[PDB]
Design a protein around this nucleic acid. Sequence first.
DNA 1: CTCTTTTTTCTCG
DNA 2: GCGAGAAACAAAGA
Length: 266
Amino acid sequence: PELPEVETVRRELEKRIVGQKIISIEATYPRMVLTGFEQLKKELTGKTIQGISRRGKYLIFEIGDDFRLISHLRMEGKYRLATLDAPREKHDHLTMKFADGQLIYADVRKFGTWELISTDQVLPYFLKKKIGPEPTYEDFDEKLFREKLRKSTKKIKPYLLEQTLVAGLGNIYVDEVLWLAKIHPEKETNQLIESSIHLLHDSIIEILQKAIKLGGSSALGSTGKMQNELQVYGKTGEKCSRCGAEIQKIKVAGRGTHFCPVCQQK
DNA sequence: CTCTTTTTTCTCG
DNA sequence: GCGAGAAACAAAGA
Ligand SMILES: [Zn+2]
């Protein structure tokens, strides 16, 4: 789950669970609640879900007057809305039970996290994480982006993955964006010229907007269509749609990295 | 059997 | 401060 998938889950949850009173909460893996599971159970039992927001790849449940449950799905987390009599599945860890169904969180690798904080702690929480701007025309200012790139000698793919230039890209969309903007993932950012930075900035907004519209790439979220539009990620050895070269895969700062060697000149 | 592969945040030098 | 590497964890493939 990168930002488009997290947004897809957000929208689905907004439609289905807003207004629901939480009747009980149970955990088979309480250690993934970083603020303390029994504390969360005591605070949130009986409260009503008022909204669901998102910041970068983080989901934010708005519960009761002043609670915010910040949920990160990391690599494999999945939510589903199930009947109250639904059978347990192996990697289910937490559930919020409502009167007419339950929201279950599963995560094979156990990396995902829940943290309960108050409303007035949300903005500080994200400042402390140093998360950069949302990828929208309004919030993602190209001028600061350009200045940050000009001053760094980091490589472009790992710098984009830091979430500090702009929030929301992970391995799939970083590789897709760099192919679309014709930039090689190992390019040192201080080597990018103004026109390439402008194409990169717009391509980040466009590609994530597109992915959100198509319901993300593939429980909640499972209906996505963006996977059918990927041009490079997981396409090793297939032909680039623009130039016909084979897509290559290399390792860049520990991550699998897919690119077209003609279109993305080193 | 071993090794590699698949978001965030740490240690190490 | 930096980058390289790895850990947190589970499972599948070679
Ligand atoms: Zn190409």
